[PDB]
Structure formats: C-alpha cells, structure tokens
C-alpha cells in the first residue's frame, strides 16, 4: 500500500517505517494533491493524525480542488481530529471550490459535536456556501434541530457577557 493508503487505513507501524528517513515525504501529495494527513483525517484515524502532526506534517496543505484535512475531518464529524488540527492553527474558515467551509460541512452532516467544537473556536457563522445557504440556513432547512440549538446557543454568547 502507498503511504496515503497506510495513513487512510491507520496502518501506523507500516507508515512509521515508510517515513523512517524523516524528510519531506511526510507531506508527499498523491495524484489529487492529498497528503497522508488528509487521508488519515478523512478516515477519522486519530492515532495516525496525532503521529503525523507530532512528526511535523503540514496541516495547511490543500489538495487540487482545495480539499483540506480540516474540511474532510469535519465532513466525517471527527470532532477530536478537528480539535487536533485547530491546535495547529489551521484556517478554521478554509473555503474550497465545492462551495463550503468546515462549519458548513459539519452542519450538512448533522455533526452536532463537531459544529459545537468549530463554534467554540470561533468559526464564522455568517459565511454562506456558494449555494447561498448559511450554516443556520442549512440546519433550519434540513430540520437538524440539535444543530440549530447549538448554533442558537453560540449566537446568544456572541451578544451577551
């Protein structure tokens, strides 16, 4: 398996062996521009994500259509991975050409805890998808009532001590 697939599948012992030399191979893009970290993030492989970040993998890298580790983790509702990436100062509002942001993806997947985490770290609630929907618009239109409540509780705090 490629290093990308080793990362995706959480084959960490094998991944460590491939990386042994410790050069820029950690950030190697595949044919679509995905790094091992993006693959691990997209599959919720927390231990592999932790290892890659601690090794020094660049969490900011965008793939060929602007996909990021943060947006793919958020799409899958992987709150703990989202938190790990945000501790490395990734752009919480990263936009990609599919039209979204981490917050939009977390809302679209009904990922309550991930929405909560993104808002707690200051993700922008005003930013519309290219489709014209804000995160609240999506939550309301889709009937995701707990997501709606989480958004409402955050909005409360924005305007009150």
């Amino acid at each position: 398996l490629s290093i990308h697939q080793l990362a995706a599948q959480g084959e960490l012992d094998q991944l460590k062996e491939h990386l042994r030399k410790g050069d820029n191979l950690v950030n190697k893009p595949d044919e679509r521009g995905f790094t091992p970290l993006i693959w691990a993030s997209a599959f919720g492989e927390i231990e592999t994500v932790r290892f890659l970040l601690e090794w020094g993998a660049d969490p900011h890298i965008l793939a060929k259509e602007r996909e990021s580790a943060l947006s793919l983790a958020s799409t899958g509702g992987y709150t703990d991975i989202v938190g790990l990436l945000l501790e490395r100062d990734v752009d919480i509002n990263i936009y990609d050409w599919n039209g979204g942001t981490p917050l939009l993806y977390a809302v679209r997947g009904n990922h309550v805890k991930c929405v909560e985490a993104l808002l707690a770290r200051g993700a922008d609630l005003t930013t519309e998808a290219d489709s014209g929907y804000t995160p609240m618009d999506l939550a309301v239109a889709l009937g995701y009532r707990k997501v709606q409540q989480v958004i409402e509780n955050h909005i409360l705090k924005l305007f009150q001590s």
């Binding site: 697939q5 997209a42 996909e67 599919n98 998808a129 889709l142």
Partner: peptide, 16 residues
C-alpha cells in the same frame, strides 16, 4: 484493500 476518499458534500438540500 484500497479505500475511497469520501466526497465533500453538496451544500444544498439535494438528497436531504
């Protein structure tokens, strides 16, 4: 075993 990168979802209401 070669796993497939998930898509970023559409941000409209298509497919609910």
């Amino acid at each position: 075993t070669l796993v497939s990168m998930p898509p970023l979802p559409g941000l409209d209401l298509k497919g609910s």
